[PDB]
Amino acid sequence: DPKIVNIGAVLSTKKHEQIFREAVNQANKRHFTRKIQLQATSVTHRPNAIQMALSVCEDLISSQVYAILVSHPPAHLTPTPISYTAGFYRIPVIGLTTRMSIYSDKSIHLSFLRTVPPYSHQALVWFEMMRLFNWNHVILIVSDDHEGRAAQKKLETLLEGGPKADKVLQFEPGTKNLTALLLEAKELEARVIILSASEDDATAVYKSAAMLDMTGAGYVWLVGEREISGSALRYAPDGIIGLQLINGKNESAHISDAVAVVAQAIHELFEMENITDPPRGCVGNTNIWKTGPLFKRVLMSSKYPDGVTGRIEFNEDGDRKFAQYSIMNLQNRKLVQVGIFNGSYIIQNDRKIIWPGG
Amino acid sequence: PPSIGIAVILVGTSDEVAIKDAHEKDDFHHLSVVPRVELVAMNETDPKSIITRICDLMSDRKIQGVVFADDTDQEAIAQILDFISAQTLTPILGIHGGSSMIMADKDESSMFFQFGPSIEQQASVMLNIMEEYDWYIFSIVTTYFPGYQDFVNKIRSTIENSFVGWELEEVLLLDMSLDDGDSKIQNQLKKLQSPIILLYCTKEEATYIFEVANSVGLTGYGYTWIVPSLVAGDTDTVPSEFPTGLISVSYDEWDYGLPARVRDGIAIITTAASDMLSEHSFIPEPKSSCYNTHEKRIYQSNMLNRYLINVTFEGRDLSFSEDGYQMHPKLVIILLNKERKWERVGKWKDKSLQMKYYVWPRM
Numbered sequence: 001d002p003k004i005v006n007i008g009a010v011l012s013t014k015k016h017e018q019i020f021r022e023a024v025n026q027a028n029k030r031h032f033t034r035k036i037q038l039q040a041t042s043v044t045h046r047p048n049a050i051q052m053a054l055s056v057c058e059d060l061i062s063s064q065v066y067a068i069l070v071s072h073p074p075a076h077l078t079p080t081p082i083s084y085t086a087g088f089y090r091i092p093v094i095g096l097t098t099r100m101s102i103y104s105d106k107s108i109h110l111s112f113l114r115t116v117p118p119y120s121h122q123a124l125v126w127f128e129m130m131r132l133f134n135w136n137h138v139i140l141i142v143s144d145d146h147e148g149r150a151a152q153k154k155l156e157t158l159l160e161g162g163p164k165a166d167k168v169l170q171f172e173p174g175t176k177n178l179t180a181l182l183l184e185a186k187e188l189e190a191r192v193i194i195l196s197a198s199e200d201d202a203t204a205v206y207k208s209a210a211m212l213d214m215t216g217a218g219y220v221w222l223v224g225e226r227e228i229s230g231s232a233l234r235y236a237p238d239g240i241i242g243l244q245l246i247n248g249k250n251e252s253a254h255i256s257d258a259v260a261v262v263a264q265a266i267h268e269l270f271e272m273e274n275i276t277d278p279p280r281g282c283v284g285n286t287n288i289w290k291t292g293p294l295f296k297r298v299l300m301s302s303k304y305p306d307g308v309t310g311r312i313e314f315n316e317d318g319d320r321k322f323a324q325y326s327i328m329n330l331q332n333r334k335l336v337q338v339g340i341f342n343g344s345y346i347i348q349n350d351r352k353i354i355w356p357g358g
Numbered sequence: 359p360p361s362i363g364i365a366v367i368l369v370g371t372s373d374e375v376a377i378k379d380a381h382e383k384d385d386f387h388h389l390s391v392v393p394r395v396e397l398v399a400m401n402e403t404d405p406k407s408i409i410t411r412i413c414d415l416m417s418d419r420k421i422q423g424v425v426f427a428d429d430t431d432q433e434a435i436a437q438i439l440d441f442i443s444a445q446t447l448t449p450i451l452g453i454h455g456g457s458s459m460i461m462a463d464k465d466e467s468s469m470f471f472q473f474g475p476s477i478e479q480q481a482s483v484m485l486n487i488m489e490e491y492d493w494y495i496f497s498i499v500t501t502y503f504p505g506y507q508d509f510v511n512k513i514r515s516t517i518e519n520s521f522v523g524w525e526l527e528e529v530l531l532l533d534m535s536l537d538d539g540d541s542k543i544q545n546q547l548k549k550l551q552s553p554i555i556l557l558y559c560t561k562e563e564a565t566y567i568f569e570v571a572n573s574v575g576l577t578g579y580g581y582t583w584i585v586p587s588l589v590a591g592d593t594d595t596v597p598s599e600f601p602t603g604l605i606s607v608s609y610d611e612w613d614y615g616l617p618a619r620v621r622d623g624i625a626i627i628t629t630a631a632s633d634m635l636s637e638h639s640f641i642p643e644p645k646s647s648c649y650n651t652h653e654k655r656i657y658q659s660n661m662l663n664r665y666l667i668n669v670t671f672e673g674r675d676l677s678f679s680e681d682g683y684q685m686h687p688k689l690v691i692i693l694l695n696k697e698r699k700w701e702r703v704g705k706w707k708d709k710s711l712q713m714k715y716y717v718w719p720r721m
């Protein structure tokens with residue numbers, strides 16, 4: 001008899017529950033498991049956020065999970081209630097597909113890592129594009145919400161680390177007539193425009209920009225994933241450059257990698273002395289898991305190089321490092337891949353970029 | 359006059375009879391609506407216990423609002439209540455204990471209000487203490503506990519605008535979401551030179567930070583620590599690691615006792631409802647359950663908030679802030695003395711700080 005250590009998961013379907021079970025079975029096969037051996041405990045998202053918090057207690061923390069994998073579900077339900085409840089006890093949560101930058105805030109999400117980067121980290125790719133194509137003067141348009149300001153904070157950090165941002169313009173999310181904003185950007189000399197916005201806000205920008213004839217030749221538009229997804233694509237100018245996080249939405253892949261990291265971290269944890277068990281259930285327990293913060297340190301320091309989604313490391317916010325992006329270019333109204341960011345390096349492929357105008 | 363349900367939840371030993379008999383100013387409800395209060399007891403203050411208790415209340419009876427008191431030092435109770443209040447759009451008042459410990463950045467949909475001073479007001483009070491005794495040179499230490507930015511910025515904003523010779527020497531940020539087996543926090547604390555040190559954290563975090571501070575010689579004479587209400591917390595519970603001479607702002611049931619507070623809670627929720635029924639010929643229907651709040655979203659609102667924050671009762675202004683704190687709290691500056699008991703040494707009332715000693719006492 002070895003010691004059974006439960007990993008938890010809130011996942012999107014029963015097919016993905018089975019994938020999680022199977023990943024853990026492989027972790028046990030791959031590892032030496034005479035001392036500790038993992039057990040998979042899992043559940044699908046509940047329809048609302050109270051029911052979900054309760055399910056974490058009743059289904060997961062009742063089984064003394066050392067960690068909880070969490071996916072973004074299908075088709076208003078965030079990881080948040082799982083991060084809240086698990087964090088009450090300092091049980092680490094691993095986000096699989098969530099990409100909002102708010103989950104990088106420690107005050108809000110104590111024990112949260114994720115195997116995908118926040119949207120704001122796309123600035124890392126923009127910046128390498130700016131050096132590559134020698135855009136030294138850019139205008140930055142972002143939405144005045146958390147995600148927009150996250151992208152500005154991140155890019156301005158890279159610029160004040162060269163190329164410069166001639167001006168930064170913010171607009172109130174929801175606004176439909178952005179002619180005022182875009183006329184302010186039109187008057188400046190710089191014709192390279194970077195955008196951070198949600199799907200529907202980017203649509204507003206694209207339209208207004210087209211009215212003011214700012215999507216033609218001379219102008220360059222550099223953008224993220226949200227701003228060329230679904231609706232945003234319907235009105236996007238031709239020539240626009242955008243990004244897609246490779247494997248960003250493959251829940252199966254991120255389950256496989258998250259389990260590999262977590263298994264490694266668990267075995268590394270039990271190399272140390274004085275490891276305590278998590279609390280058995282929520283009822284009557286109000287103390288944090290004493291070993292929670294150590295296990296987080298171990299997770300955060302974890303390196304898995306041979307991962308399905310590439311090279312798994314985490315930065316100081318517990319966000320994925322060395323993510324890989326498709327560099328996309330809207331050509332005759334088709335999203336065409338013109339390159340990848342391979343984690344550190346831009347690699348242009350043989351498909352030629354067509355800029356706005358060309 | 360129609361009755362509205364008000365649950366009063368009491369965690370830990372408390373005189374239900376002294377509480378019920380104080381609300382005998384129920385013959386002092388004159389409005390469009392009368393309170394139908396029901397005392398519930400609760401034994402546990404984990405998330406599941408608290409959630410299921412309030413949600414069983416809401417389904418077994420017709421609750422319009424909740425008045426919550428507890429006897430613990432657990433600031434996470436505020437956070438749980440705010441989550442429940444925002445999900446179900448029920449008014450909740452944290453009047454005592456952990457439930458009343460500052461929660462920063464309440465949900466936008468929150469109808470959760472707390473008896474106690476804002477984070478920014480305790481910071482301003484802490485600077486008034488320092489101005490009085492000419493302690494102009496100081497440093498800040500915080501964790502990632504929500505509010506710590508609002509605290510540091512309130513300090514910074516105040517002393518930038520001042521013809522006074524403030525000198526903020528150092529601001530430390532301590533990550534206690536990781537273990538301290540690398541002696542990181544010790545190596546951060548080692549950088550403090552200032553004789554005054556403002557510490558913003560939770561009570562359980564202060565316990566550890568003081569233990570480390572002590573072992574690098576930062577607790578004795580020549581070092582004065584000032585902390586906010588929630589670190590002192592329950593004053594009848596003093597961790598051995600707390601230094602003597604620790605100063606604290608405080609609101610912990612000194613002159614404003616529990617029976618009084620439940621009275622004002624029931625008053626605020628009842629007045630509010632009356633003001634809205636007065637003026638819209640309806641009040642929001644209590645949620646039948648919290649397990650069906652994904653459906654009934656478009657039918658629910660935080661409309662009652664405008665009125666919850668503007669109640670005057672028995673000639674006192676019981677207004678709240680948008681941020682969900684009491685507007686005009688009576689505060690007490692306490693000092694941990696040589697016999698490990700918290701001692702009153704000052705009052706704050708009406709923007710005026712009146713301290714007891716002119717020359718600061720020696721422990």
Ligand SMILES: *[C@@H]1O[C@H](CO)[C@@H](O[C@@H]2O[C@H](CO)[C@@H](O[C@@H]3O[C@H](CO[C@H]4O[C@H](CO)[C@@H](O)[C@H](O)[C@@H]4O)[C@@H](O)[C@H](O[C@H]4O[C@H](CO)[C@@H](O)[C@H](O)[C@@H]4O)[C@@H]3O)[C@H](O)[C@H]2NC(C)=O)[C@H](O)[C@H]1NC(C)=O
Nearest residue numbers: 305309310311312322323324340341342343344345346347
């Ligand atoms: C994303 O793409 C980048 C760029 O291609 C990759 O980073 C490179 O990875 C390769 C490994 O394939 C590294 O290649 C090695 O370079 C060594 C010395 O390079 C120096 O000089 C170069 C250019 O002047 C600099 O970039 C670099 O910083 C060094 O200063 C060589 O000595 C190595 O040779 C060894 O292996 C070869 C195999 O063919 C043997 O024949 C040799 O005997 C020897 O053992 C090797 O060629 C390269 O250094 C990396 N560059 C940088 C900038 O990091 C990333 O790997 C890739 N990322 C992902 C996730 O795929």
Ligand SMILES: CCN(CCc1ccc(Cl)c(Cl)c1)C[C@H](O)COc1ccc(NS(C)(=O)=O)cc1
Nearest residue numbers: 084085088107108405437441501502503534535
């Ligand atoms: C803002 C949202 N809350 C969520 C809390 C919560 C909400 C709802 C439920 Cl249902 C539960 Cl269960 C918990 C954040 C939470 O309150 C974070 O708590 C702390 C954050 C940082 C610190 N400081 S640190 C990083 O050094 O340890 C301490 C506590």
Ligand SMILES: *[C@@H]1O[C@H](CO)[C@@H](O)[C@H](O)[C@H]1NC(C)=O
Nearest residue numbers: 247250251252253254256308
């Ligand atoms: C997702 O990744 C898995 C590997 O775990 C792979 O088998 C599958 O083809 C991928 N799915 C997509 C849509 O690329």
Ligand SMILES: *[C@@H]1O[C@H](CO)[C@@H](O)[C@H](O)[C@H]1NC(C)=O
Nearest residue numbers: 270271272273274275276277
């Ligand atoms: C942990 O260390 C303590 C002493 O601090 C000791 O009493 C106990 O036996 C140890 N337990 C484990 C599981 O290492």
Ligand SMILES: *[C@@H]1O[C@H](CO)[C@@H](O)[C@H](O)[C@H]1NC(C)=O
Nearest residue numbers: 370398399400401402407411
């Ligand atoms: C709380 O515990 C006491 C005994 O300590 C018991 O009498 C009471 O029924 C309990 N109430 C609840 C709600 O658990």
Ligand SMILES: *[C@@H]1O[C@H](CO)[C@@H](O)[C@H](O)[C@H]1NC(C)=O
Nearest residue numbers: 633665667668669670675677
């Ligand atoms: C509500 O606030 C207004 C000022 O905004 C003021 O008349 C009073 O404080 C409140 N009105 C009442 C209590 O009738």
Ligand SMILES: [Cl-]
Nearest residue numbers: 057281282283
């Ligand atoms: Cl439980």
Ligand SMILES: [Cl-]
Nearest residue numbers: 338348351353
């Ligand atoms: Cl190309």
Ligand SMILES: [Cl-]
Nearest residue numbers: 400401402407
């Ligand atoms: Cl109970």
Ligand SMILES: [Cl-]
Nearest residue numbers: 441444445465
């Ligand atoms: Cl919430």
Ligand SMILES: [Cl-]
Nearest residue numbers: 431560561562
């Ligand atoms: Cl605490």
Ligand code: NA
Nearest residue numbers: 112113317318
């Ligand atoms: Na994190």
